[PDB]
Amino acid sequence: GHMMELSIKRCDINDLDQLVDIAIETFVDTFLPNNKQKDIDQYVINAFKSSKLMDELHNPESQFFFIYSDEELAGYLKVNVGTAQTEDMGPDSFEVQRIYVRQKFKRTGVGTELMTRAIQLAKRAKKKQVWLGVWEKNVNAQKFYEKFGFIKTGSHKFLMGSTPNHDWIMTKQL
């Protein structure tokens, strides 16, 4: 096609099947390098169940976004505010809970566009900081967030099957 620009969309319940599919695909791709598929499966079978993501799609303090590259789905983003945050960071905070780019679109600026939009949304929502959890072994993501001015401010355990994983908490104030 002739569409070089990326386009953003807010997901609705008719995107559920597509959301489930990309959520699983990108999660496995991210964690399979250093986690067993058996452990990834147990995380997926609870977090990305269709009924589970349906309720999250109905949470008005959360929002899912799809990003398209020449009319093909290239990644997705989930943000939380208020009581939808996975940690109680308070009324002035804005969580990026999920931010993923499909493999075939990596290294083409899709992730930077998603995060740039996430920060725009936080500003419009009058929030004072953006925060997120990043696996301590996902050094590429760490460097990605660091170029946006995120800084490690703590940690948080992340259970994947029977294996305890450790997320960094990274924060960008503004």
Author numbering: -2 to 171
What does the article say, verbatim?
Members of the GCN5-related N-acetyltransferase (GNAT) family are found in all domains of life and are involved in processes ranging from protein synthesis and gene expression to detoxification and virulence. Despite their sequence and structural diversity, all acetyltransferases function by transferring an acetyl group from the cosubstrate acetyl-coenzyme A (Ac-CoA) to the amino group of a specific substrate; the substrates can be very diverse across the enzymes, ranging from small metabolites such as amino acids to secondary metabolites such as antibiotics. Interestingly, a representative of such guanidine riboswitch-associated GNATs, a GNAT from Lactobacillus curia (LcGNAT), performs acetyl­ation of the arginine antimetabolite canavanine (or δ-oxa-arginine) but not of arginine itself. Hence, it has been suggested that LcGNAT serves a similar biological purpose as CtdAs, namely prevention of the misincorporation of canavanine into the bacterial proteome, as acetylation makes canavanine unusable for protein synthesis by the ribosome.
The crystal form obtained in this study contains two molecular copies in the asymmetric unit, which are essentially identical (r.m.s.d. of 0.73 Å for all 174 Cα atoms). Thus, we conclude that LcGNAT is likely to be monomeric in its biologically relevant state. The LcGNAT fold approximates, but does not exactly follow, the canonical topology of the GNAT enzyme family: β0–β1–α1–α2–β2–β3–β4–α3–β5–α4–β6. Instead, LcGNAT consists of seven β-strands and four α-helices with composition β1–α1–α2–β2–β3–β4–α3–β5–α4–β6–β7, therefore lacking an N-terminal β0 strand and including a C-terminal β7 strand. The sequence of the P-loop is highly conserved in GNATs, hosting a consensus motif (R/Q-X-X-G-X-A/G; Favrot et al., 2016; Burckhardt & Escalante-Semerena, 2020). Interestingly, the P-loop of LcGNAT is degenerated, as is also often the case in polyamine acetyltransferases. Here, we mutated Tyr97 in LcGNAT to the similarly sized, but catalytically inert, phenylalanine. The Y97F LcGNAT variant also showed a significantly decreased catalytic activity.
